[PDB]
């Protein structure tokens, strides 16, 4: 699970980086500009994720074998 999301978040990162330009390179005129205020706003909500995706990994993960090991005997 939760990994795959971070992978999904990176996929969104590009995805954004593209269509968030998509129309722009191809052309309701400030409405546009809110399509864009959005475009970012979507990017935003993403970066949000990035941020939250984020707090996720735990950091001495090598030994966790040897932990497993004591547990193995358990």
């Amino acid at each position: 699970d939760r990994l795959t999301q971070l992978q999904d978040a990176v996929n969104s990162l590009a995805d954004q980086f593209c269509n968030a330009i998509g129309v722009l390179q191809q052309c309701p005129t400030e409405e546009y500009a809110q399509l864009f205020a959005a475009l970012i706003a979507r990017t935003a909500k993403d970066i949000d994720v990035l941020i939250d995706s984020l707090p996720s990994e735990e950091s001495t993960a090598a030994l966790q074998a040897a932990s497993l090991y004591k547990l193995e005997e358990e």
Partner: peptide, 17 residues
Amino acid sequence: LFVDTADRLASLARDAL
């Protein structure tokens, strides 16, 4: 230059991802 830079991305988008 403009749109081309964009497609450039889109390439990245798919192929990359």
